[PDB]
Amino acid sequence: SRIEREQHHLIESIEKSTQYMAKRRIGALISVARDTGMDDYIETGIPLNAKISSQLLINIFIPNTPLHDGAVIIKGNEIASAASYLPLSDSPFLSKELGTRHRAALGISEVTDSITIVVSEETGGISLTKGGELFRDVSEEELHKILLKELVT
């Protein structure tokens, strides 16, 4: 069916783009909206309303480019916005070796049911946040299984 194919394409697009960016240590921050509206953070970014593709995600996060400075927010079947703000967690439990992208991913995860993916520009490690929890430096298998569980409904 249609939504099936879209959600699997979304997963593939996330997996391909973060693999590309992780090998090159390109920082990335991708938040996927679910039941909780994120329109109030979409409004802070540059509106794209674009089809989802691994290629567009990669191009967005290229450093020192107009769209890279913040978060991509995916809503339904579109890349809604780029360079968006996400709220920074105040948690002192988040390791000090992790940067602003991780703290923003943790922050949005505390106030929405979104699923947020981080690529670290320091390590290339991929992490995910959900419900105020951080899954740090996930494997490709782990990333795949989590995206399947959380994004295919």
Asked whether position 139 contacts Na ion by CB under 5 A, the answer is no
- What amino acid occupies position 85? Y
Window of 4-12, 37-45, 81-89, 93-101 that interacts with Na ion by CB under 5 A: 93-101
State in angstroms the smallest separation of the CB of 68 from Na ion. Answer: 27
Q: Which is nearer to Na ion, 68 or 103 (CB)?
A: 103
Q: Which is nearer to Na ion, 67 or 146 (CB)?
A: 146
**Residues at the annotated binding site for ATP?**
69, 86, 99-102, 120-122
Asked whether position 95 contacts Na ion by CB under 5 A, the answer is yes
Strand order in the sheet with 115-119: 46-51, 78-84, 71-75, 28-32, 115-119, 126-130, 133-135
Task: Please tell me the count of residues contacting Na ion according to CB under 5 A.
Answer: 2
Which residue spans within the chain are E strands per DSSP? 28-32, 46-51, 71-75, 78-84, 115-119, 126-130, 133-135
Contact 104, 87 (CB under 8 A): yes
Q: Which is nearer to Na ion, 1 or 93 (CB)?
A: 93
Contact footprint for Na ion (CB under 5 A) = 93, 95
